[PDB]
Point group: D2
Chain length 425, copies 4
């Protein structure tokens, strides 16, 4: 229909130049796709009640950040419990259940050179309490990441390490840090104090671009809607900043004081949700996909190979979604790196992976709870049908839509290799 091609900035996406693309942006072109940039919300006095946390999950919060610079282990354990209670209050309807990751933000070293003793204690707390992500403060070199990995021990092997770049050394040794990290956070608060305030946008734009190139999650953090700590609506600069972090290529956007101690924590999440949707529709996918494709090296990994084929096929048919079966979340991450306009609906039995895929832009995790079928092929089809039913319920899909289904040839992680074009019935 003609009405379909007027929505989600499709006239601006068809443009032959980036300049023409900007000229074609329409304020009356409504976003249709689900919001793909994840929202990380910092937990605190303003956002700890189980009832408040339920409203924040409904508003769009995907990751709950526990800032270990404040409060005790007793405090942070109560936080975790409330978050888990609010998340599990929706587990009765598995077709609409939304998993929420739990991230531990470390205090950092200070006048010291290596992992603080407090950081070791907090890291072991995180492992003991089952945190999904670690935002490692003041990462200056690759050995800092290794020290955090060591402090997580053998049981914390599944936790994701997102290195916070907060100073000039971190920016200068970025490549070696990214290589050993699972992703990066652009920690603008300290970065804006350690380097000239007028140079932070260069570091942000550079780090996001390099993470996009590497296929690793990148978080944009600090003062994004700061005025919403006290004021019910944000400034013109604030909405612009959020929209531009998405347009830069950020996988996640964050709320610090806006959710931890503010008067508008649910309003702050709803505002980030509203802006991200508008900004994602305004992304110039034509140039973006082409540049991501050109820059990405040749691969002999079937998962990587299937991922680019699936993304290419999704663009060809205007696929509503790409449904992927994933154990560790890697298959979904590899789809996400090519920035498809189609939602990546990731069906997994791993609750940890379902929470951790929120770090990847455009990945919508679905936790499958049914016990395995005797016939493996039947188990696969049940999980694909689960993705279709959830996607239909949540508005991602309609009868007649085309979806790309990404699966593998045998059970267990590492074997994705099949891409099938599917019509929704």
């Amino acid at each position: 229909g003609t009405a379909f091609f007027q929505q989600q900035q499709l006239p601006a996406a068809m443009a032959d130049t980036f300049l023409e693309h900007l000229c074609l942006l329409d304020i009356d072109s409504e976003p249709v796709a689900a919001r793909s940039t994840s929202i990380i919300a910092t937990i605190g006095p303003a956002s700890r009640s189980v009832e408040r946390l339920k409203e924040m999950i409904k508003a769009g919060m995907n990751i709950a950040r526990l800032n270990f610079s404040h409060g005790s282990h007793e405090y942070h354990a109560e936080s975790i419990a409330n978050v888990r209670e609010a998340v599990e209050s929706f587990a009765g309807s598995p077709l609409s259940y939304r998993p929420v990751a739990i991230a531990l933000d470390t205090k950092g070293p200070g006048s010291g050179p290596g992992l603080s003793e407090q950081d070791v204690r907090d890291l072991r707390f995180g492992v003991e309490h089952g945190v999904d992500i670690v935002f490692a403060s003041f990462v200056r070199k690759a050995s800092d990441v290794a020290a955090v990995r060591a402090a997580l021990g053998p049981e914390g092997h599944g936790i994701k390490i997102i290195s916070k770049i907060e100073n000039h050394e971190g920016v200068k040794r970025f490549d070696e840090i990214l290589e050993v990290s699972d992703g990066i956070m652009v920690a603008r608060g300290d970065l804006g104090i350690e380097i000239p305030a007028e140079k932070v946008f260069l570091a942000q734009k550079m780090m996001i671009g390099r993470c996009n190139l590497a296929g690793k999650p990148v978080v944009c953090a600090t003062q994004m809607l700061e005025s919403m700590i006290t004021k019910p609506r944000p400034t013109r600069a604030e909405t612009s900043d959020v929209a531009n972090a998405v347009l830069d290529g950020a996988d996640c956007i964050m709320l610090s004081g806006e959710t931890a101690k503010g008067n508008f924590p649910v309003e702050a999440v709803k505002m980030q949700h509203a802006i991200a949707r508008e900004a994602e529709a305004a992304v110039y996918h034509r140039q973006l996909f082409e540049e991501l494709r050109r820059a990405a090296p040749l691969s002999r990994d079937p998962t990587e190979v299937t991922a680019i084929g699936a993304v290419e096929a999704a663009f060809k048919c205007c696929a509503a979604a790409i449904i992927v079966l994933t154990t560790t979340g890697r298959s979904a991450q590899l789809l996400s790196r090519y920035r498809p306009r189609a939602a990546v609906i990731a069906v997994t039995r791993s609750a940890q992976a379902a929470r951790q895929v929120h770090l990847c832009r455009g990945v919508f995790p679905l936790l499958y709870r049914e016990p395995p079928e005797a016939i493996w092929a039947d188990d696969v089809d049940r999980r694909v049908q689960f993705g279709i039913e959830s996607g239909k319920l949540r508005g991602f899909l309609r009868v007649g839509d085309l979806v790309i289904v990404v699966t593998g040839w045998r059970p267990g992680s590492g074997y994705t290799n099949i891409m099938r074009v599917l019509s929704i019935s």
Copy 2:
């Protein structure tokens, strides 16, 4: 894993180039072609190439399609030629390494207002003798194609109609002619007489580009190696012309007097084979694929959607081949339209389709003769392995190579929707 020596062959340094100009600068005479020759050779069969023994040498030299010019000879004469071609082709039906299906094409005499009386009789002859292709002479408008289609009696509806564009009206009505034809022949002999000789290259380049855009086979014909009718080696202009027809985007190249009446018919086939191999390696796939992609409209046909995904995946891993199961040849044709550097090995039970897919650049047909398995999925795997083993048998594949496998979800033509990444074992 592949080695530096691999990346020096088949003009891979020139293929990596960021500009077309840099691409030309990087062409290396010492970079040997490795891939199988993808541009099919059409050889006109006449007194010089009629004998079963001569035809066997021509099949070994690279002839894929045998052309019978109904402007000369009789029905009795051409039926003898067809019988000899079929006898020479079936002499290799024992050894799968030597066996190659060869299409049989009837070139009509031409019209007068509408279809000639002789053309109706010759077209009826073609149907009765089971010809695969018709090169319809002097096609001027879409009604001419319809008249040929109508002449291909009740039994001839599967024959391919390749419209010969030989005059100014055919060039001017090209779009309407291509829409109703299976493909086009750039009939340069008459075209060089009907229009100024210095304008024929414009018509050739335009028609090839439009056929490439449409995804339909295009043949470059007449005087390609003319001097070789009397001389053992061609001129500098002749080798250039053949190389440039391939670089233009031609699916097939033709030999007329060179094979029909000349003194070196086998040498002419060998020469076209040698040049096509060099020219195909020198194709700038980076710009070509990107432009084919950008120009091709969005599609909701799973076959077309799977085809672009498969070609994308093949480029990503330097896939040795794309093995496709096809009944009509459509699935292979849709892969071919995106000009992959990988060979399209099409496994089919249809002998007609196996001969007709020679019209498509880079399609290597394999006729499957085994009786159907009780389990359809098992019948499918047996055909995929038939593809793989013959591939290994001919030097396309080695254990450890990556291949893209294109199949459908249910039997019968029209359901192609699966793309798998398989490692050769």
Copy 3:
């Protein structure tokens, strides 16, 4: 590397590390972002003009002198507040502070004066207060009018009519503040001299989360049209009370420049803020960083692909001059202009070289601040008897001022844009000159 090998040997590796030159050489936009370096210092003069709203915090002649030194190019008078007596006093103080530097014409900085109207209201036709304020502007010699709540092309015609016959030289920058203005943008831009993205009212009239779409669209269309575009409101809002801005604020300013804005504005930050000089200094610091980070390779190519063929020698000379400047890494493009049009046409192709515009018109020298990358020089000498000699004196004035202000150094290449006969509309010559 071969496209810069000899020039790298000549200018030095240190030259090619500064002003984001490694990021500018990138083959893709993505690679360009990856190559941005915080250690790559900006060298070029700041090209995006700063508009500062003058109020109680920034009225004193001594304060205004510090703001001119900080980088203020245009002084804005908001006729929504204050009186005619109040605003006339502000204008007088601005003029006094500007003329305090007129003693050295090689370092004198012209400052434009802009009147921001109050706007219509519940009623549509030009308000009676607007007619009185527009008459005031004409009488006081304002250079620009920021026309509030422009909704259609007839609105801009009504403002031009209220300016009268004597206000023909004033520039009309239409403020787009509502949904109607955004929807009828093309018709408004056609009849306006430029546009202001009035984000304050725009953020109230349309959803706050959609304003960035309107900003990016309007800037792109103004860039396409070759007309000045201003980004306004809440750019450094927190600096009204604090000495340092938020991370979102510095980002917003940098992104307005990267979007393609010719001018950036300060409202409450300079009118009623506690740190008006610090706000100007902050916008100056960010704009310089952001201009160096512009991906000129794609930008110039897209401006050329989009721009239609032209048979106007001024337009033709402008693209040739910008192309030549990119080829040699020209330090500046010196242009002789009467109305500012020749400089405006150079500016539309977004050169990295500074457009040093030499003019005898004081009004045009102030008005060219609306054009990104145009550095106006007011020529005060009386005309030479030989016209060709008068032209060469003005070109030499530009070279001497350029050398004086640090724009030029011996050995630099400059592109000189002049015409074949006196008077406006005859620009058609481009020269490559080496600085001695």
Copy 4:
């Protein structure tokens, strides 16, 4: 109607593929033929009357193959060429200069052969403009030819013929020290596999285009026309593709030296080149040439790109350039403008040598210098406009780009002007 001619719909295309699709056989070429024709002079094309027909047909350079004939024979040919050329000198607004090129025999089993030294000394004594040096294998071979030309032969252009595998492999070092290259396909097709010659041709042309140096495509281009009045489909294709490859010059060997239709062969190359030049995808070409060309601090280099850019912007009919040595015109030519580069020069040798550069139309200025240098410059610019108007390049109302310098002499080009005709 203007935008339907000279493949302008195909030139507006956003992709190369769309460009090919838009090529129109009914779109007539309007601009003058840019690719120069080199004709080998022999028994079939030696008469003064024959040579006059060949000049009118389009011959720009006359080649004398020193592999056959004697010094007495070739001197007679030179005299006949010069006589036929000077028969049109009466009308200087329509006079067409013709270069004279000596093609050496080569070293054969050997450094520089003794016959080559004698022939090179002959060329210097007879005032040849170009030398096509046979079998150039390395940079020292070029130096040996340069040395054999001596002090009197400093002005002669050396076009190195690449005829074997060593020449192809050491191409970069040879091009660096040569004025240009000839893709000598006859010997190349024997020295390397026949099916690999197109790779060497396309590579050499691209590299010469990149370097801004003339490249000639030679041998068997219209071979059948030695005995037949019309060429083959492959032959017309080959000529059109040499132009589309980026060749500055195309050559005729046996076709003009010993063939039955030498004038018809020249006419045929002229007809095809015109069609092929209009079909060039300038959008991609200029952009790639622009991107690839290095940054320069030479005002001639800088003015050249500005002039070509300005010409594309207004659909300039021509770019009129004042040149002493031909360098300023050569630098304009390297950016492949669609506008004709009308080069006004007082040097007769430079006027002949500029035929090596594609799209450069030399005009020999034969008026004595004015007292005021600025007035002398304007007279030469007006000469270009009058000759252009006469030859059909210009019409009143057209826009032209005028490229001049700030001071007399060679190496000072730095000015570009936009001028409206009449």
